[PDB]
Design a protein around this motif. Structure first.
Motif, mmCIF file in Angstrom:
data_model
loop_
_atom_site.group_PDB
_atom_site.id
_atom_site.type_symbol
_atom_site.label_atom_id
_atom_site.label_comp_id
_atom_site.label_asym_id
_atom_site.label_seq_id
_atom_site.Cartn_x
_atom_site.Cartn_y
_atom_site.Cartn_z
ATOM 1 N N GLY A 37 -33.505 41.498 32.567
ATOM 2 C CA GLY A 37 -33.911 42.225 33.760
ATOM 3 C C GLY A 37 -34.924 43.297 33.419
ATOM 4 N N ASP A 38 -34.625 44.536 33.817
ATOM 5 C CA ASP A 38 -35.492 45.655 33.471
ATOM 6 C C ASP A 38 -35.347 46.061 32.011
ATOM 7 O OD1 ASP A 38 -33.840 46.155 36.199
ATOM 8 O OD2 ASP A 38 -35.976 46.485 36.587
ATOM 9 N N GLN A 39 -34.235 45.708 31.372
ATOM 10 C CA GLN A 39 -33.975 46.108 29.997
ATOM 11 C C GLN A 39 -34.549 45.092 29.021
ATOM 12 O OE1 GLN A 39 -29.571 47.140 30.047
ATOM 13 N NE2 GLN A 39 -30.342 48.786 28.725
ATOM 14 N N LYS A 40 -35.240 45.595 28.003
ATOM 15 C CA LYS A 40 -35.782 44.778 26.932
ATOM 16 C C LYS A 40 -35.447 45.424 25.598
ATOM 17 C CE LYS A 40 -39.455 47.460 25.548
ATOM 18 N NZ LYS A 40 -40.008 47.697 24.182
ATOM 19 N N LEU A 41 -35.306 44.591 24.571
ATOM 20 C CA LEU A 41 -35.022 45.059 23.222
ATOM 21 C C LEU A 41 -35.954 44.358 22.248
ATOM 22 C CD1 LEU A 41 -33.338 46.535 21.043
ATOM 23 C CD2 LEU A 41 -31.935 44.461 20.958
ATOM 24 N N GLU A 42 -36.764 45.136 21.539
ATOM 25 C CA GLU A 42 -37.563 44.614 20.440
ATOM 26 C C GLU A 42 -36.699 44.624 19.186
ATOM 27 O OE1 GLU A 42 -41.718 46.702 21.730
ATOM 28 O OE2 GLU A 42 -41.784 45.429 19.940
ATOM 29 N N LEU A 43 -36.479 43.443 18.604
ATOM 30 C CA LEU A 43 -35.588 43.323 17.454
ATOM 31 C C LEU A 43 -36.050 44.136 16.253
ATOM 32 C CD1 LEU A 43 -34.746 39.522 17.609
ATOM 33 C CD2 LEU A 43 -33.493 41.463 18.578
ATOM 34 N N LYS A 44 -37.277 44.659 16.272
ATOM 35 C CA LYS A 44 -37.735 45.511 15.180
ATOM 36 C C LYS A 44 -37.032 46.860 15.198
ATOM 37 C CE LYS A 44 -40.274 43.606 17.109
ATOM 38 N NZ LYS A 44 -39.906 42.474 18.003
ATOM 39 N N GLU A 45 -36.574 47.298 16.366
ATOM 40 C CA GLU A 45 -35.922 48.589 16.518
ATOM 41 C C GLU A 45 -34.411 48.511 16.337
ATOM 42 O OE1 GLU A 45 -37.093 49.501 20.445
ATOM 43 O OE2 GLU A 45 -39.239 49.636 19.994
ATOM 44 N N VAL A 46 -33.891 47.387 15.851
ATOM 45 C CA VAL A 46 -32.451 47.224 15.682
ATOM 46 C C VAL A 46 -32.046 47.870 14.362
ATOM 47 C CG1 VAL A 46 -30.598 45.589 15.259
ATOM 48 C CG2 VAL A 46 -32.190 45.211 17.141
ATOM 49 N N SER A 47 -31.260 48.940 14.439
ATOM 50 C CA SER A 47 -30.793 49.638 13.252
ATOM 51 C C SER A 47 -29.380 49.243 12.843
ATOM 52 C CB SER A 47 -30.854 51.156 13.476
ATOM 53 O OG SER A 47 -30.192 51.530 14.669
ATOM 54 N N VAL A 55 -28.721 50.265 18.308
ATOM 55 C CA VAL A 55 -27.557 49.452 17.980
ATOM 56 C C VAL A 55 -27.507 48.261 18.928
ATOM 57 C CG1 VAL A 55 -25.053 49.361 17.933
ATOM 58 C CG2 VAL A 55 -26.249 51.357 17.003
ATOM 59 N N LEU A 56 -27.640 47.063 18.375
ATOM 60 C CA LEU A 56 -27.429 45.852 19.151
ATOM 61 C C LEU A 56 -25.934 45.579 19.254
ATOM 62 C CD1 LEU A 56 -28.443 43.289 20.568
ATOM 63 C CD2 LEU A 56 -28.502 42.204 18.312
ATOM 64 N N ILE A 57 -25.454 45.349 20.471
ATOM 65 C CA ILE A 57 -24.041 45.092 20.721
ATOM 66 C C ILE A 57 -23.919 43.664 21.229
ATOM 67 C CG2 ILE A 57 -22.057 45.654 22.166
ATOM 68 C CD1 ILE A 57 -22.815 48.564 21.936
ATOM 69 N N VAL A 58 -23.289 42.809 20.433
ATOM 70 C CA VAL A 58 -23.174 41.385 20.724
ATOM 71 C C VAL A 58 -21.805 41.161 21.357
ATOM 72 C CG1 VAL A 58 -23.491 39.072 19.824
ATOM 73 C CG2 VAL A 58 -24.584 41.013 18.695
ATOM 74 N N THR A 59 -21.785 41.005 22.681
ATOM 75 C CA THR A 59 -20.541 40.838 23.424
ATOM 76 C C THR A 59 -20.694 39.744 24.474
ATOM 77 O OG1 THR A 59 -19.073 41.936 25.016
ATOM 78 C CG2 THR A 59 -21.317 42.792 24.797
ATOM 79 N N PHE A 60 -20.011 39.891 25.608
ATOM 80 C CA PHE A 60 -20.227 39.021 26.756
ATOM 81 C C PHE A 60 -19.893 39.797 28.024
ATOM 82 C CE2 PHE A 60 -15.917 37.609 28.075
ATOM 83 C CZ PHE A 60 -15.172 38.137 27.040
ATOM 84 N N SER A 61 -20.298 39.231 29.164
ATOM 85 C CA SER A 61 -20.277 39.974 30.422
ATOM 86 C C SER A 61 -18.865 40.346 30.857
ATOM 87 C CB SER A 61 -20.967 39.159 31.519
ATOM 88 O OG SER A 61 -22.343 38.987 31.234
ATOM 89 N N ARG A 62 -17.874 39.504 30.563
ATOM 90 C CA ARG A 62 -16.506 39.744 31.004
ATOM 91 C C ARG A 62 -15.641 40.389 29.925
ATOM 92 N NH1 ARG A 62 -14.275 36.288 35.966
ATOM 93 N NH2 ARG A 62 -16.268 35.565 36.846
ATOM 94 N N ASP A 63 -16.255 40.973 28.900
ATOM 95 C CA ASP A 63 -15.495 41.683 27.884
ATOM 96 C C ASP A 63 -15.025 43.030 28.432
ATOM 97 O OD1 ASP A 63 -14.309 42.347 25.464
ATOM 98 O OD2 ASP A 63 -16.190 42.984 24.531
ATOM 99 N N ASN A 64 -13.941 43.537 27.850
ATOM 100 C CA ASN A 64 -13.186 44.637 28.438
ATOM 101 C C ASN A 64 -13.925 45.963 28.259
ATOM 102 O OD1 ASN A 64 -12.520 45.562 25.736
ATOM 103 N ND2 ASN A 64 -10.915 43.989 25.687
ATOM 104 N N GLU A 65 -13.240 47.065 28.583
ATOM 105 C CA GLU A 65 -13.740 48.440 28.573
ATOM 106 C C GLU A 65 -13.970 49.009 27.160
ATOM 107 O OE1 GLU A 65 -9.704 48.203 30.682
ATOM 108 O OE2 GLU A 65 -11.352 46.878 30.088
#
Lengths: 12, 319, 305, 12
Positions: free
Chosen positions: C57-67, C2-12
């Motif tokens: 950073g250490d995290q990467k996401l291949e868009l092929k695995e986006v369900s 699951v790709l989550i499109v947010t921003f760094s200062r978004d809430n809990e």
């Protein structure tokens, strides 16, 4: 404080 | 009545269409988006209120009488005074844009084209992907803010080179005068050593495909106007060690025509300006479809295509 | 994934949705739109080659695995240094926006919600029109830059008055860097004598309906979470007629998430105000009435439908 | 040259 596309600015 | 969404400094496409509309027995109202709100009065009622109404001096358009909409040019609030506060001016522009967009999106009748379709077709990455799924060749494209991926991309296409371009339309007014624009430009060996600015703004890079012809394809409904021009700086067929050009009609293969129609049908468009190129070995590469691309320079100039007539017909005939 | 499109200062809201996705045996990648392009690397390939990859950073996401995609918060590139040239900065913001929007639009799988659906439901004038076509009561509304039509609109509703509001979201920062905002505000008789500024920016005026309750309705799929407060939120049971009409409104715009605002009059008339496809919900979950909404979002993101 | 919404600016 420049972006990369600044180097490709022409004039019209 | 046909509502024509344009602006005051639009070109000769507007009078070409209104006169062809008027000559067909129907009427047309011209709505200059840049002259709102400073000059044009727009009243938008929601509920069981009075009828929405656009007032431009002596001219007056009741929105209940709108039978078709030409979603042509959108320059909301440009004629706002320059001496206005920059914070209020930017906020006013966004309010005007949302207001007129809501008006257009609420109007019934035939739209050319609907906002939701133009908005969805404006994703150029989705254009190429859908065209490729339809069997059309597309150039290798990379939008990236990452120098290592860009270096790797320019290296595998080193023989023919790559270009760069921006997905957005804008201009930088620098120094004291001129406007500056990023045209599609070749990236050089020197540009590849100065990729550090990508962390502040990505760019879109594409395989530079050597082409024999440039195609300008304008589609109105299911009518296809194809124009070609020889852009070869070195034309092989004419080369002679001993020893101008203009746009001319061109016959697409029926397979390419049917694929472009499926491209229009996917996005839900009844108008589109499509850019293609043809290699010397007659490979057809899809570049871009602009749902609001120009057409007047193919009508007032060779091959003098009668597109404004076709647009006025589909506007007043719906389907 | 699951790709989550947010921003760094978004809430809990993000972590709970993430933990609920992870606790259900799936993976989730958080994509902070404001940290691109200054920090996050995106590479979008078109053609015979790849689809794309997101590097953080250490995290990467291949868009092929986006369900699936949670279209949550879109603050494209707001972490650009403010020491940058303003002309180049606004041009960069517009380029970053079109780049990520094309990324999201091209992705397959289940979107919550699709961009094309959210852009279409963003027309508030269309919301009121479609809500009325479905049988929902809407307040008399006038968007206008015309003082004469506004004065008649205020005389028409002189008994209860009118309010004014902006269709757009923004904030004016004064000299002290304080944040100014145009809330929904009453329109006085003194305001009616100073309507000349409408030629520089229109406003949206509405019938001021006297209300007993304000309703906050959050819909995930076909699950309806209704909260009510006296104008300390409490549960509330909508009449089934209202619930079905709201479900038809969502099905029209093609949304599976929505933040719907309504009011109830003392004589129990239900007025539709607005639907926000990306409206907040967390304050109804961490505070009364403690709706388990983040669980419902994660379940619809993982289980598609 | 002020727009009309300036009359309704509150403090957040």
């Amino acid at each position: 404080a420049l972006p990369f596309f600044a180097r490709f600015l022409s004039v019209s | 009545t046909v509502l024509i969404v344009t602006f005051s400094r639009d070109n000769e496409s507007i009078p070409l269409v209104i006169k062809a509309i008027e000559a067909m027995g129907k009427k047309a109202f011209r709505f200059d988006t840049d002259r709102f709100p400073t000059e044009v009065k727009v009243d938008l009622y929601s509920g069981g209120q009075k009828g929405g109404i656009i007032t431009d001096g002596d001219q007056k358009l009741e929105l209940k009488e709108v039978s078709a909409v030409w979603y042509r040019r959108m320059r909301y609030g440009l004629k706002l005074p320059d001496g206005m506060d920059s914070q209020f001016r930017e906020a006013s522009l966004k309010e005007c844009r949302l207001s007129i967009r809501g008006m257009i999106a609420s109007l019934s009748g035939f739209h050319l084209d609907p906002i939701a379709k133009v908005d969805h077709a404006n994703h150029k990455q989705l254009q190429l992907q859908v065209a490729r799924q339809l069997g059309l060749l597309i150039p290798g494209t990379l939008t990236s803010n990452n120098p290592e991926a860009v270096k790797q991309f320019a290296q595998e296409f080193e023989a023919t080179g790559i270009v760069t371009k921006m997905l957005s339309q804008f201009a930088i007014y620098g120094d004291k005068q001129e406007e500056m624009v990023v045209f599609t430009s070749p990236v050089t060996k020197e540009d590849l050593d100065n990729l550090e600015g990508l962390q502040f703004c990505p760019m879109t890079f594409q395989e530079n495909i050597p082409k024999a012809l440039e195609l300008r394809i304008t589609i109105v409904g299911e009518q296809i106007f194809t124009a070609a021009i020889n852009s070869q700086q070195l034309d092989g067929a004419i080369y002679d060690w001993r020893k101008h050009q203009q746009w001319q009609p061109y016959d697409l293969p029926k397979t390419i025509e049917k694929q472009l129609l499926e491209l229009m049908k996917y996005f839900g468009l009844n108008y589109g300006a499509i850019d293609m190129i043809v290699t010397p070995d007659e490979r057809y590469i899809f570049l871009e479809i602009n749902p609001v691309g120009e057409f007047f320079w193919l009508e007032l100039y060779p091959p003098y295509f009668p597109i404004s007539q076709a647009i006025a017909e589909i506007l007043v005939n719906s389907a």
